[PDB]
Amino acid sequence: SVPIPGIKDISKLKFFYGFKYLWNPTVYNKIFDKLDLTKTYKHPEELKVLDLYPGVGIQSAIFYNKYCPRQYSLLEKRSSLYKFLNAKFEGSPLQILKRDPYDWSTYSNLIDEERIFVPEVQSSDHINDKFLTVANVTGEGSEGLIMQWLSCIGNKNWLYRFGKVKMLLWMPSTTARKLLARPGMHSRSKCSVVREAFTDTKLIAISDANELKGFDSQCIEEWDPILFSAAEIWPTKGKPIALVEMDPIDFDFDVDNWDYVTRHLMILKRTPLNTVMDSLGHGGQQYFNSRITDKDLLKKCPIDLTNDEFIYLTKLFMEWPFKPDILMDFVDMY
Amino acid sequence: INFFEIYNSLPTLEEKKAFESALNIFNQDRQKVLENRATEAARERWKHDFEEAKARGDISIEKNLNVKLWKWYNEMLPLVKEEINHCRSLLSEKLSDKKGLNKVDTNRLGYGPYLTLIDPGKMCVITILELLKLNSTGGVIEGMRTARAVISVGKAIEMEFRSEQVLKSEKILWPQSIRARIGSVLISMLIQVAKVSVQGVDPVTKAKVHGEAPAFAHGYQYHNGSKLGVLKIHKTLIRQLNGERLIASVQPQLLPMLVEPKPWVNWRSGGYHYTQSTLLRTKDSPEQVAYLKAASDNGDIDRVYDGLNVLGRTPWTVNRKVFDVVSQVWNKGEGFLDIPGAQDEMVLPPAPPKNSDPSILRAWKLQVKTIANKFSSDRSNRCDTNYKLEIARAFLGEKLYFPHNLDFRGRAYPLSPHFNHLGNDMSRGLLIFWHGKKLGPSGLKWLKIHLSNLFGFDKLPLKDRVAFTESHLQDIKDSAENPLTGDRWWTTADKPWQALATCFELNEVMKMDNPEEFISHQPVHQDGTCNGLQHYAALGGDVEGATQVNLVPSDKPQDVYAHVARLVQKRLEIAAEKGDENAKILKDKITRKVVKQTVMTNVYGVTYVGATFQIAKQLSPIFDDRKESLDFSKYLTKHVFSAIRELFHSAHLIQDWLGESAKRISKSIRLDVDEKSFKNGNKPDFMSSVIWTTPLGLPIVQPYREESKKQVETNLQTVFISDPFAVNPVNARRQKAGLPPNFIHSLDASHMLLSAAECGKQGLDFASVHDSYWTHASDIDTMNVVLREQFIKLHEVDLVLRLKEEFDQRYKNYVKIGKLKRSTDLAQKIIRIRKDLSRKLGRSTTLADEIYFEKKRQELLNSPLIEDRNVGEKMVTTVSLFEDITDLDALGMSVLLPLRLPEIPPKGDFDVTVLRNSQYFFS
RNA sequence: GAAA
DNA sequence: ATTATGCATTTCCGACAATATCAATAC
DNA sequence: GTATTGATATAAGTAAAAATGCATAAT
Ligand SMILES: *O[C@H]1[C@@H](O)[C@H](n2cnc3c(=O)[nH]c(N)nc32)O[C@@H]1COP(=O)(O)OP(=O)(O)OP(=O)(O)O
């Protein structure tokens, strides 16, 4: 009952700002079946969904035709994309707003100021049953926005004050590889540590078979991602894209100290711990040598460590009496 | 034993000369003590403090800095000794390769011989002093940068060896890699040794915990997704280093002299008696040093010597009254005038809840960063004032001298960097002349005009200025009687300390009945208005420029900045017809300060963002808008650029000619130098920099090049540094953007030096701040005459034409690059010759081969044998056929062109002599 | 901070 | 062949301005 | 095997893209 934009229509658009979009209804059906959101959300007719950077809107139209949610909203401020969305989706229950998803004040002015989109707050013992958010951040310069949203998962402030809001995001292949790297892998970084600490992420689909070697073979076997060619994404000059599902989880550490410890430890990501604690302050090496009795810990590199080991280290850092000030970690540039 | 009071008390000229001779004989040992070097002075001071502490029982915290430094030196010297022994053992054999650890010994084989030359205690003290000097530098909150510290320590060790070698002389340079390795090795050894004692509180016990912690630690930080190796200093050391014993801990090495400076007779002789200083300040350039040595050999720089000697021969002393007022203000503790105010530690607003708005969290982080930056800036600005006041205390009531140097352009600066008369208003008000000359019949008028100028009313006629000064007599009296605990009228001036000194002198004059016979020491300033624009007008013969920069005599002094501000306000009134709100907000908000900076900088080649920042910096205090006023500043820049483009024409013409000449020089290749193969293809190296000479014979070489930043493996880390000891292609944009300002500044410096030399010949006391010249109040008329005559003599010739002739002579045989389409018959001939010459050579002849053939053909005509010359003329090369053509500049393949410079713009017929009576040329 |  | 594209007036005072890890090559 | 120059990632609001300040060079 909702029109689905076609390849000829979406091909008339001039600028996509580096964002690749998908237009194949068959692979949309495949990925929706793989996700199996019908069981997670017991009342799809009572489901409120927020869409960020929709672009073509084909995914939103197929989502509506498949589930019939209680409310769906598209946030798109780019000129031609919004114009095409209004032209193709007017006269339908889908709603399009001329707002830019990057601004932090946009969500406040949309939720508690203008009183348009209000999610349902529930307990943290289960995934948010009446709130779903969908995003498409494929622009290669917009990885900072993804990391900011992960930090917002950590702080429970941006959209996670509502609960365990399930995330569905299209990201570039490199970003997914970096976020889904296991201990010991060459691509593991602080983004991987944040992903392991805050979320539970799965690779629902990818756009290139040759890029799967960046992921762990065991994780690939468990996930069973859906693969499709690059001919199904309209702007064909871009790198392959991937789809992930992020489920926020519970944690029992302090975010500021953990962030400081991980950031200053993973700078030297191939150096054993018996020579990197000197970078955490004055006397750090002797203090941590005295306070740590484990054997392989003093020889493991921080790329070999995991979230539990990092939490142990940050708890020791808290217990340090002579610890440095976390706040005074910046430069006097401007 | 005060000497200035005795000198003033002596009533006879012969007795004054006798006392001056006695003082000069007596001050030699004091000069030797002052010029005693840093390593020896620091070592003796630290050992003395340690001995005194050992004598007085056990007192640690009182002299903690010096006691700790001596302890560290004593317990860290053996590490350096053992490393030197290890290096000797690993170099004495000199037999095996791939010996030891790959990272360890291959580095030692590199930095070994550079460590065995200098004394181990000497490197110890050098490292300690450098690391104490470079604190809170580079944006690091409480420490230095590793890249900075390794170079500074290594460079200091290199410099101390040069002094030791030359001292024994009564080896060229060290590589940057070696400097970095030495610095890293020694800083690591100091880190391993430096221990401080601090007490903290246990989080779970809430009681004090005792222990010893390293003083220095090596860590990394981030700024916009990029690493930053840093070195930190513990708070227990910061609190003492930023204290009032910093002068005792780090003794200065370039202080004002007590005896008359050694005259300049050679490019490496002059200034201090025991310290060797080069005439020029060459940051990193061997070409400038080579050209300076060649000029010194030729002997074409002697007026430069005369001017610098006149500048350095003037005696100074410390103003006791202003010093006492400054000391009272400083000891009070409250922030007064521009002294910020002594605060101990930071104050931070309470953090919001963690689950608050991300915008709120970002705002809080921004506020914290701003507060920390302000606190650090205030602490630095207070430490600088403390250092200057301690030097003033040291040299109180004593004769002073300030030997001068030059920078690569030619402008003159004192050798002493800490306390001199180029500082801020406090430093300029803390210094007076040693010789006190009678005021005569004009000193009163000139001193009153000086005070009126120091109150910012330096755009009024002289009658108005003296009327202002004589109307404010009661305020002058009150300010000079009780500066503090009074009406504080002198603080309203834009130069408060100088106004205070002038008020002291004026009251001391007014207390008598015969002001003519008063003895004054206060220097009086006379500076030109829009000096760069004046020089541009003189260069271009611009009658309009001359009449608007006060060159043409007039009753009232003009102000180009006020004129431009008024014109732009009229333009905004015009735009009020459209009445856009952005224009309406700033229509009447124009200020002559903003217009002044923009108009001054425009003739030097300023860009849109530069003008935007210049306008915004001075528009912030007006607070017309938020920090997003950059839109308002950009509109301001647009219309002020339109106005200045309308106004200034001949100056921009000369600027364009200079820029075009710089481009032609930067895109040129030498014949003999670049005849060798480069194996880069059709892209020959550009090794030519814009060089010219001042009318005084000083050669100026532009040092702009391209910097290659590569990581160097040091002990602490791998620093990201460049090599300024290697030849690199010249930065064309830098040369083109630097020539127009450098030429004008060189002209300014030459005129200042001419005036200084003539005033020295005429027996006056001369001091200068670039475009501003100081002297006694009674010698101002003679000084004005000297300046006018020197300016007329300097600009009597066509300086731009002489520069063009010099460029043509120095670039006789040079090759440019040009692309012309083969559609033209002439341009296709070059392509045919290139094909024909390739077949003749038997291979694919390149641009390098063609240039080499042209250079070799020229050598034939330059050969003494006519037969070779006849063959050379008979032989036609690629560039030879293009010598006659001078119109193909605008008429595809790249072809070689000769170096021809643009024609000089027409110069208006303006007689520069007419300024010999212009009252407001300098004021 | 100082000068164009 | 117009598209990207680095840079934004000069000088001096300590007056600045990234480092680690890896991935094929070269020897 | 050891040794070497180049490519790539880091953090994460003072966006990136598109549309400009602007000249110079380029993929
Ligand atoms: O007022 C200045 C000054 O006290 C100090 N400061 C900043 N840079 C320097 C410097 O190179 N040398 C010295 N001796 N002192 C310095 O910090 C204060 C803050 O200066 P701002 O950043 O506000 O202004 P800046 O000098 O950068 O202005 P400009 O020269 O770019 O116009």
PDB file of N, CA and C in Angstrom, chain B residues 842-874:
ATOM      1  N   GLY B 842      71.074  11.236 -30.957  1.00  0.00           N
ATOM      2  CA  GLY B 842      70.983   9.795 -31.059  1.00  0.00           C
ATOM      3  C   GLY B 842      70.116   9.127 -30.019  1.00  0.00           C
ATOM      4  N   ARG B 843      69.358   9.893 -29.241  1.00  0.00           N
ATOM      5  CA  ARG B 843      68.484   9.339 -28.214  1.00  0.00           C
ATOM      6  C   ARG B 843      67.385  10.355 -27.929  1.00  0.00           C
ATOM      7  N   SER B 844      66.465   9.979 -27.044  1.00  0.00           N
ATOM      8  CA  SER B 844      65.378  10.873 -26.652  1.00  0.00           C
ATOM      9  C   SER B 844      65.959  11.990 -25.796  1.00  0.00           C
ATOM     10  N   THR B 845      66.200  13.143 -26.415  1.00  0.00           N
ATOM     11  CA  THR B 845      66.788  14.270 -25.706  1.00  0.00           C
ATOM     12  C   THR B 845      65.754  14.914 -24.790  1.00  0.00           C
ATOM     13  N   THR B 846      66.146  15.158 -23.544  1.00  0.00           N
ATOM     14  CA  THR B 846      65.252  15.676 -22.524  1.00  0.00           C
ATOM     15  C   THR B 846      65.481  17.172 -22.317  1.00  0.00           C
ATOM     16  N   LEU B 847      64.696  17.750 -21.404  1.00  0.00           N
ATOM     17  CA  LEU B 847      64.868  19.158 -21.064  1.00  0.00           C
ATOM     18  C   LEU B 847      66.233  19.407 -20.437  1.00  0.00           C
ATOM     19  N   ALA B 848      66.688  18.486 -19.584  1.00  0.00           N
ATOM     20  CA  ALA B 848      68.014  18.623 -18.993  1.00  0.00           C
ATOM     21  C   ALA B 848      69.093  18.600 -20.064  1.00  0.00           C
ATOM     22  N   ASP B 849      68.962  17.702 -21.044  1.00  0.00           N
ATOM     23  CA  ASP B 849      69.935  17.643 -22.131  1.00  0.00           C
ATOM     24  C   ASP B 849      69.918  18.922 -22.957  1.00  0.00           C
ATOM     25  N   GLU B 850      68.725  19.453 -23.239  1.00  0.00           N
ATOM     26  CA  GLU B 850      68.632  20.691 -24.010  1.00  0.00           C
ATOM     27  C   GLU B 850      69.259  21.860 -23.259  1.00  0.00           C
ATOM     28  N   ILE B 851      69.004  21.953 -21.953  1.00  0.00           N
ATOM     29  CA  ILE B 851      69.585  23.026 -21.151  1.00  0.00           C
ATOM     30  C   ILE B 851      71.101  22.883 -21.083  1.00  0.00           C
ATOM     31  N   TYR B 852      71.593  21.649 -20.946  1.00  0.00           N
ATOM     32  CA  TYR B 852      73.035  21.427 -20.941  1.00  0.00           C
ATOM     33  C   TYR B 852      73.655  21.821 -22.275  1.00  0.00           C
ATOM     34  N   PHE B 853      72.976  21.513 -23.382  1.00  0.00           N
ATOM     35  CA  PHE B 853      73.478  21.913 -24.692  1.00  0.00           C
ATOM     36  C   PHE B 853      73.526  23.429 -24.821  1.00  0.00           C
ATOM     37  N   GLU B 854      72.484  24.118 -24.346  1.00  0.00           N
ATOM     38  CA  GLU B 854      72.486  25.577 -24.387  1.00  0.00           C
ATOM     39  C   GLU B 854      73.616  26.157 -23.541  1.00  0.00           C
ATOM     40  N   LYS B 855      73.838  25.597 -22.349  1.00  0.00           N
ATOM     41  CA  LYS B 855      74.922  26.076 -21.494  1.00  0.00           C
ATOM     42  C   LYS B 855      76.284  25.828 -22.132  1.00  0.00           C
ATOM     43  N   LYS B 856      76.473  24.650 -22.730  1.00  0.00           N
ATOM     44  CA  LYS B 856      77.733  24.344 -23.397  1.00  0.00           C
ATOM     45  C   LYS B 856      77.946  25.218 -24.626  1.00  0.00           C
ATOM     46  N   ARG B 857      76.869  25.550 -25.343  1.00  0.00           N
ATOM     47  CA  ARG B 857      76.986  26.458 -26.479  1.00  0.00           C
ATOM     48  C   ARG B 857      77.418  27.847 -26.028  1.00  0.00           C
ATOM     49  N   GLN B 858      76.900  28.305 -24.885  1.00  0.00           N
ATOM     50  CA  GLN B 858      77.310  29.599 -24.349  1.00  0.00           C
ATOM     51  C   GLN B 858      78.790  29.604 -23.989  1.00  0.00           C
ATOM     52  N   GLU B 859      79.296  28.481 -23.473  1.00  0.00           N
ATOM     53  CA  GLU B 859      80.706  28.399 -23.107  1.00  0.00           C
ATOM     54  C   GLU B 859      81.613  28.602 -24.312  1.00  0.00           C
ATOM     55  N   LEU B 860      81.140  28.243 -25.506  1.00  0.00           N
ATOM     56  CA  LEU B 860      81.934  28.459 -26.710  1.00  0.00           C
ATOM     57  C   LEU B 860      82.121  29.946 -26.986  1.00  0.00           C
ATOM     58  N   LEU B 861      81.025  30.710 -26.978  1.00  0.00           N
ATOM     59  CA  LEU B 861      81.113  32.148 -27.208  1.00  0.00           C
ATOM     60  C   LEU B 861      81.836  32.872 -26.081  1.00  0.00           C
ATOM     61  N   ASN B 862      81.860  32.295 -24.880  1.00  0.00           N
ATOM     62  CA  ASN B 862      82.617  32.865 -23.775  1.00  0.00           C
ATOM     63  C   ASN B 862      84.077  32.432 -23.774  1.00  0.00           C
ATOM     64  N   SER B 863      84.445  31.457 -24.603  1.00  0.00           N
ATOM     65  CA  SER B 863      85.825  31.008 -24.661  1.00  0.00           C
ATOM     66  C   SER B 863      86.711  32.088 -25.278  1.00  0.00           C
ATOM     67  N   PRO B 864      87.956  32.213 -24.811  1.00  0.00           N
ATOM     68  CA  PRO B 864      88.866  33.202 -25.412  1.00  0.00           C
ATOM     69  C   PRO B 864      89.128  32.962 -26.888  1.00  0.00           C
ATOM     70  N   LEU B 865      89.140  31.706 -27.325  1.00  0.00           N
ATOM     71  CA  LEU B 865      89.387  31.400 -28.727  1.00  0.00           C
ATOM     72  C   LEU B 865      88.196  31.822 -29.577  1.00  0.00           C
ATOM     73  N   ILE B 866      88.473  32.568 -30.649  1.00  0.00           N
ATOM     74  CA  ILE B 866      87.406  33.018 -31.537  1.00  0.00           C
ATOM     75  C   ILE B 866      86.822  31.850 -32.320  1.00  0.00           C
ATOM     76  N   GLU B 867      87.639  30.839 -32.626  1.00  0.00           N
ATOM     77  CA  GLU B 867      87.147  29.691 -33.382  1.00  0.00           C
ATOM     78  C   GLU B 867      86.042  28.966 -32.624  1.00  0.00           C
ATOM     79  N   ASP B 868      86.233  28.752 -31.321  1.00  0.00           N
ATOM     80  CA  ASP B 868      85.169  28.175 -30.506  1.00  0.00           C
ATOM     81  C   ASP B 868      83.961  29.101 -30.450  1.00  0.00           C
ATOM     82  N   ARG B 869      84.202  30.407 -30.297  1.00  0.00           N
ATOM     83  CA  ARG B 869      83.105  31.369 -30.258  1.00  0.00           C
ATOM     84  C   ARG B 869      82.346  31.399 -31.578  1.00  0.00           C
ATOM     85  N   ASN B 870      83.065  31.307 -32.700  1.00  0.00           N
ATOM     86  CA  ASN B 870      82.402  31.274 -33.999  1.00  0.00           C
ATOM     87  C   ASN B 870      81.518  30.041 -34.132  1.00  0.00           C
ATOM     88  N   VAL B 871      82.002  28.890 -33.659  1.00  0.00           N
ATOM     89  CA  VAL B 871      81.194  27.675 -33.689  1.00  0.00           C
ATOM     90  C   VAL B 871      79.979  27.822 -32.781  1.00  0.00           C
ATOM     91  N   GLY B 872      80.169  28.425 -31.605  1.00  0.00           N
ATOM     92  CA  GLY B 872      79.052  28.612 -30.691  1.00  0.00           C
ATOM     93  C   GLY B 872      77.951  29.468 -31.286  1.00  0.00           C
ATOM     94  N   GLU B 873      78.326  30.591 -31.902  1.00  0.00           N
ATOM     95  CA  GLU B 873      77.339  31.410 -32.597  1.00  0.00           C
ATOM     96  C   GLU B 873      76.734  30.654 -33.772  1.00  0.00           C
ATOM     97  N   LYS B 874      77.561  29.901 -34.503  1.00  0.00           N
ATOM     98  CA  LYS B 874      77.050  29.096 -35.608  1.00  0.00           C
ATOM     99  C   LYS B 874      76.110  28.006 -35.110  1.00  0.00           C
TER     100      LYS B 874
END
